[PDB]
Structure formats: structure tokens, C-alpha cells
């Protein structure tokens, strides 16, 4: 019931790039 952190990540190692990349044009 647990673990559910790989979609979570996302949303922190999405920022992570997104933080570089332009922003959403």
C-alpha cells in the first residue's frame, strides 16, 4: 500500500529538467 513514489518523482525530476529547459512555450 506503499511505494508509490515513482510517479511522484516524476513530478520532482520533471522540475529537475523542466527547471532548465525553457518554459512551457
Do not use: G, R, W, Y
Request: charged content about 30%.
Amino acid at each position: 500500500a506503499k511505494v508509490n513514489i515513482k510517479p511522484l518523482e516524476d513530478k520532482i525530476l520533471v522540475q529537475a529538467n523542466e527547471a532548465e529547459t525553457t518554459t512551457a512555450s
